[PDB]
Write a protein that binds this ligand. Structure first.
Ligand code: ADP
Length: 323
C-alpha cells in the first residue's frame, strides 16, 4: 500500500461523487478560476481563497447587528453592478439606507427591491427573480424575518410547530439548482440576536445549503484618541466548499463610509512587509506615512499615487491574472 496514492484516489472519488471541494487539505494552494464577486474587502477576498464570493452559490453572512454584514452585502452588490450586473434586494426588515448604499458605490436606481408579505412570498419572489437568469446577485435581508404566513396571520396551536425551518429548507432545496444554472449569488443576511442561546430558524437549513458561511463580528471601535468614526470587523470563513475554510480577515468600516481601502492597504502592507511598522510610526520605502494608523490612513488617502503602488505590490504578491 502507498498511502498518498491511495488517498488521492479516495479524494478523487469523494469529489466526483459529491462535488469539487467535498474534501481538501487546509494547506491547499487552490488553482480554479471560479467567477467571484469581490467582497469589498481585499483581506476577506484572500481569506475566501477565490478572491471574493463564489457566483451561483448560497452565501450566509451571520453575526450580531452592527458587525459589518450589510456593508459587505452592499459592497458586493456595488461590485456586481459595476461589472454590468443586475441586483435584487429582498427586504423583510425595512432597514436598508439607500443613501449609505450609494456611498458604497451601489446604483440604487437600478436596484430591485421587494418587501414581501410573508416569509413564503419572500423566498418565492427571490426564486422567481433568480431563475430568470437576469441577476448576478440577490441579497435577502434577515433570515429570521422570513416568518411563516401562518404565524404572521394569527394561528395559535398553543405550540404550533417548527415550520419556518422547513420553509427555509424546501425553499433552498429548489433555489440552489436555479442559482447554479443562473450563476446568481444568493447572500442571506443572518442577524443573530437576544444575548445568548450560527442559526436563526432557517439558518439551520442554510448551514448545509451554503457554499460559503461568514461569521461577521465587531471586535474594535476605531479611534484616534477618543475620536471614533467607525469600528473594526473580524470575519471568519467557517464554511468554504470552494477553498480551504477556517481562514480569517479584518477591516475597518468608518462611520458613514464602507470598508476602508487604505486601512486594508496598511494592514496587509505591514503583515506582508511592504510597509514597515516601526512602533508608533509607519513607513513605505523611506517615505513617512505618519504616526498612527489614522494618519497613515489619511496619508494614503491624500497620496493616491502611493497606496496604488502599494496595492499593486500586495496584489501581485497574492492574486494576479490566473489561468
Ligand atoms: N445607514 C448607515 N449610515 C451610516 N453608516 C452606516 C449605515 N449602515 C451601516 N453603517 C456603518 O457600517 C457599520 C456596520 O453596519 P451593518 O453592516 O449594516 O450592520 P450589520 O452587521 O447588522 O449588517 C455600522 O456600524 C456603521 O459603521
Amino acid at each position: 500500500p502507498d498511502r498518498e496514492k491511495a488517498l488521492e484516489l479516495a479524494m478523487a472519488q469523494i469529489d466526483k461523487n459529491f462535488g469539487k471541494g467535498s474534501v481538501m487539505r487546509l494547506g491547499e494552494e487552490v488553482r480554479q478560476p471560479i467567477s467571484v464577486i469581490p467582497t469589498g474587502s481585499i483581506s476577506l477576498d484572500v481569506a475566501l481563497g477565490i478572491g471574493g464570493l463564489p457566483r451561483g452559490r448560497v452565501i450566509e453572512i451571520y453575526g450580531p447587528e452592527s458587525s459589518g454584514k450589510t456593508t459587505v452585502a452592499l459592497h458586493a452588490v456595488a461590485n456586481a453592478q459595476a461589472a454590468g450586473g443586475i441586483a435584487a434586494f429582498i427586504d423583510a426588515e425595512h432597514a436598508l439606507d439607500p443613501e449609505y448604499a450609494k456611498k458604497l458605490g451601489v446604483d440604487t436606481d437600478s436596484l430591485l427591491v421587494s418587501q414581501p408579505d410573508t416569509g413564503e412570498q419572500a423566498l418565492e419572489i427571490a426564486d422567481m427573480l433568480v431563475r430568470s437568469g437576469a441577476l448576478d446577485i440577490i441579497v435577502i435581508d434577515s433570515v429570521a424575518a422570513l416568518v411563516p404566513r401562518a404565524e404572521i396571520e394569527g394561528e395559535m396551536g398553543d405550540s404550533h410547530v417548527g415550520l419556518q425551518a422547513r420553509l427555509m429548507s424546501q425553499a433552498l432545496r429548489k433555489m440552489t439548482g436555479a442559482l447554479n444554472n443562473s450563476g446568481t449569488t444568493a447572500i442571506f443576511i443572518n442577524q443573530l440576536r437576544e444575548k445568548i442561546g450560527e442559526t436563526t430558524t432557517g439558518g439551520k437549513a442554510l448551514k448545509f445549503y451554503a457554499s460559503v458561511r461568514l461569521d461577521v463580528r465587531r471586535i474594535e471601535t476605531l479611534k484616534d484618541g477618543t475620536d471614533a468614526v467607525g469600528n473594526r470587523t473580524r470575519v471568519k470563513v467557517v464554511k468554504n466548499k470552494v477553498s480551504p475554510p477556517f481562514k480569517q480577515a479584518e477591516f475597518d468600516i468608518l462611520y458613514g463610509q464602507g470598508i476602508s481601502r487604505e486601512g486594508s492597504l496598511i494592514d496587509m502592507g505591514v503583515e506582508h512587509g511592504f510597509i514597515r511598522k516601526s512602533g508608533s510610526w509607519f513607513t513605505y520605502e523611506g517615505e513617512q506615512l505618519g504616526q498612527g494608523k489614522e494618519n497613515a490612513r489619511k496619508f494614503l488617502l491624500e497620496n493616491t499615487d502611493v497606496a496604488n503602488e502599494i496595492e499593486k505590490k500586495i496584489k501581485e504578491k497574492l492574486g494576479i491574472g490566473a489561468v
